[PDB]
Amino acid sequence: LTKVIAQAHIDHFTKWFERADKIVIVSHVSPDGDAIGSSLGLYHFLDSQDKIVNVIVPNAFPDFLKWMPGSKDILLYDRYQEFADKLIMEADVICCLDFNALKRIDEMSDIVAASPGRKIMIDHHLYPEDFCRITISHPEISSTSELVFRLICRMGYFSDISKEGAECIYTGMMTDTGGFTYNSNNREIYFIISELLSKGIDKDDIYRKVYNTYSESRLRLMGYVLSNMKVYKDYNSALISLTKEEQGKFDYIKGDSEGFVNIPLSIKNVCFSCFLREDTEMIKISLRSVGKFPCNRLAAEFFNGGGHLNASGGEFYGTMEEAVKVFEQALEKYKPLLKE
Amino acid sequence: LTKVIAQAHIDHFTKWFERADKIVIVSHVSPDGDAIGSSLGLYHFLDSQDKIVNVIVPNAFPDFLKWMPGSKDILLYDRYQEFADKLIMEADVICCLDFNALKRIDEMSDIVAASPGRKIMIDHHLYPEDFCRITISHPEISSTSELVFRLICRMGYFSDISKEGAECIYTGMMTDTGGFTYNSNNREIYFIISELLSKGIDKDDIYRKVYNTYSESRLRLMGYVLSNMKVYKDYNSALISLTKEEQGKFDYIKGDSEGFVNIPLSIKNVCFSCFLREDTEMIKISLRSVGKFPCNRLAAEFFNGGGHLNASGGEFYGTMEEAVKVFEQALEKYKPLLKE
Ligand SMILES: Nc1nc2c(ncn2[C@@H]2O[C@H](COP(=O)(O)O)[C@@H](O)[C@H]2O)c(=O)[nH]1
Ligand SMILES: Nc1nc2c(ncn2[C@@H]2O[C@H](COP(=O)(O)O)[C@@H](O)[C@H]2O)c(=O)[nH]1
Ligand SMILES: [Mn+2]
Ligand SMILES: [Mn+2]
Ligand SMILES: [Mn+2]
Ligand SMILES: [Mn+2]
Numbered sequence A, B: 001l002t003k004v005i006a007q008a009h010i011d012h013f014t015k016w017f018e019r020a021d022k023i024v025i026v027s028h029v030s031p032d033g034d035a036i037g038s039s040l041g042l043y044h045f046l047d048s049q050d051k052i053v054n055v056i057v058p059n060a061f062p063d064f065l066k067w068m069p070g071s072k073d074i075l076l077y078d079r080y081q082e083f084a085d086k087l088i089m090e091a092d093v094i095c096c097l098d099f100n101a102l103k104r105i106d107e108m109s110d111i112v113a114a115s116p117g118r119k120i121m122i123d124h125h126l127y128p129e130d131f132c133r134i135t136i137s138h139p140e141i142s143s144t145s146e147l148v149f150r151l152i153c154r155m156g157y158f159s160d161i162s163k164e165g166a167e168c169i170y171t172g173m174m175t176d177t178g179g180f181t182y183n184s185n186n187r188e189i190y191f192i193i194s195e196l197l198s199k200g201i202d203k204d205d206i207y208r209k210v211y212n213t214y215s216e217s218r219l220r221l222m223g224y225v226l227s228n229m230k231v232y233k234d235y236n237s238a239l240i241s242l243t244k245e246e247q248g249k250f251d252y253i254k255g256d257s258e259g260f261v262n263i264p265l266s267i268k269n270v271c272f273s274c275f276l277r278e279d280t281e282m283i284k285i286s287l288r289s290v291g292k293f294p295c296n297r298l299a300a301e302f303f304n305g306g307g308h309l310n311a312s313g314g315e316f317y318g319t320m321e322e323a324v325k326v327f328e329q330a331l332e333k334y335k336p337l338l339k340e
Helices: A007-019 A033-048 A077-090 A109-114 A144-154 A163-175 A187-197 A203-211 A216-228 A244-249 A295-300 A320-334 B007-019 B033-048 B077-090 B109-114 B144-154 B163-175 B187-197 B203-211 B216-228 B244-249 B295-300 B320-334
Strands: A022-027 A052-057 A093-097 A118-123 A134-137 A230-232 A237-242 A272-278 A283-289 A311-316 B022-027 B052-057 B093-097 B118-123 B134-137 B230-232 B237-242 B272-278 B283-289 B311-316
Touching (some): A007 A118, A007 A134, A007 A144, A033 A052, A033 A093, A033 A144, A033 A163, A077 A109, A144 A163, A144 A187, A163 A187, A187 A203, A187 B187, A216 A237, A216 B216, A237 A244, A237 A320, A244 A272, A283 A295, A283 A320, B007 B118, B007 B144, B022 B033, B022 B077, B033 B052, B033 B093, B033 B163, B052 B077, B077 B109, B118 B144, B144 B163, B144 B187, B163 B187, B187 B203, B237 B320, B244 B272, B272 B320, B283 B320, B295 B311, B311 B320
Parallel strands (some): A022 A093, A093 A118, A118 A134, A237 A272, B093 B118, B118 B134
Antiparallel strands (some): A230 A237, A272 A283, A283 A311, B230 B237, B283 B311
8 A cells, every 4th residue: 555665766666677588586695585585586576478477596495385386496505506507697687686796696696797788686684785686675574475465566567467467476575474474464464464365365275285285293292392401591592393303303404493582482582482493413503683682782782694684693602502602602601681 | 335234233232322331342262353453442442331341251362462451351251250240240341352152251151141241243154153142243353352343343333442452452353364364365355454554554564563573482482383294295294392392492382383383284295284282291282274274173073172164273282293193184084185
């Protein structure tokens, strides 16, 4: 309903749009629901508009996202670099969805930066770089998927949004809000949900296909991590872990411990959650927080990383109680902040 | 938006409404989010309309529902029967929200049935009895909370719905859809969410106050049950359990194992989930299912109970592997259905 995107930007992109013949859509390393959804959504739109479109991500994406229309044709740069470089270098327009720093598409940086094709960035993360000639950056919006839906509507093609395109955009929105349980207080989100529903999607099904589909090993693996988690009541934090030794017990396939770092946050008075997953061999740190505790800050001040205010990670080389000690001092330092 | 409730019923209730001075609102035994929310919502509305209102439930309600505006004044029939009987017998109007059979308000049946006050039933469960002079029964709607919002709007008081009233109605809707993850595919649900948001509520907060607030003992208790659950891959079912012996280990307070029977349903190809919680002393059975497997049917054909298509329970007197055996034959019988 409300105009969030600059009408100017919209007009300028519309110009590139009609002139363009070959468009390439790119997203960040380790594509997540919003990354794949927003890109597949734009892809479907652009594709119905008599245009050559190719979605290229740096990496592989979760299996719970394979059911999406078009995922099969998403080109993974780490296995077809050659082909991709050609597509990228020959593109008229290059849409960068869901990331605002070239370092984010790690590996693809060079070729994307090198391409003479005009670039446009549609994102919602804070502090956007200026490598794109057109920049649609709105941190005030919950997902890239959502403003890809706004951009298409503002351009007058709401009617041209297919059910497949609608399924993807909704997935991206759902994902970045954890099923609309955080950063979803804006009314318009629900007007859009209602509109997508009118394209024929089954939101309840999309939900199950992403969150309620996975081996009994993963769910049991979870039950394990939960029993062994440690809760530092006075620091309002919590820590869960997994050694290569443990991973082998439950036959850990990559992606099992997903969303595990979140579970601890559902405890009454625990707003900071840490997950130390011993990488096969040193320790993989994942930070999550409800409220305003800056995870990205402790992520950089103790585990050579970064990320966002509520979610971020990084690695610490050593062992289990070694990482734990590190985490435990990080806690002692921020104990007063963790108290506010 | 769409007219779901019979304009006639609305007009008839409006008549009782203006004439009435003292109104009593009742809900089902073991009130859940929809029960407390829909009742507190109507209460707040009726109360702003210069009327005497009293919410009386047969039982105590979860603590994760205590934050709601007005819960403190909800009269529990099992501790103030005398007072309540007076309120009930003297009421001009008696609203029965979220149940359609007198047996549902177990204990309160007699006095409610005896009261000369005119009754109205607002519910969404299947097969409604006819003890109320006015009956608003719509199984096609996801919550009682939702059509209490429709009834108030149809009556022309959308503007008179307070933020407190809005907080309650939203909670009821969220609860009965498990955070809008099931039976929520209807567009209008989201128009209503958007409207409530405009009353000033913080849906994200309401969410955390109900689902992300509970001791580390409960979450750990869960991690335990999950590690020990059994999955009958070929029957597409799963079973989790808790003996009084176990409950004591994790210091089980009533309500800990809530929503536990659901967790197993998130496994890829497990649509039936059984929870045998050994009651302190014989076994408490809880059945849940995704899809269409009739839980209420197996609930009655093996554990002297009943309930709904997707959720229901009942008790089986004996021991752990005794209940398990029972459950295991129930499976063998319906193995072919569980296969479709
Ligand atoms: N700069 C930086 N960011 C990271 C690192 N690890 C994780 N992140 C950020 O945090 C998010 C992932 O959190 P995770 O899923 O690993 O718990 C990603 O979106 C990513 O931007 C890291 O080592 N360095
Ligand atoms: N008739 C009948 N219904 C039950 C019984 N136990 C549970 N239910 C139904 O199933 C729901 C509770 O499922 P639960 O939370 O115990 O797993 C309630 O709404 C209730 O109507 C029982 O023993 N008899
Ligand atoms: Mn993303
Ligand atoms: Mn995003
Ligand atoms: Mn109910
Ligand atoms: Mn209900």
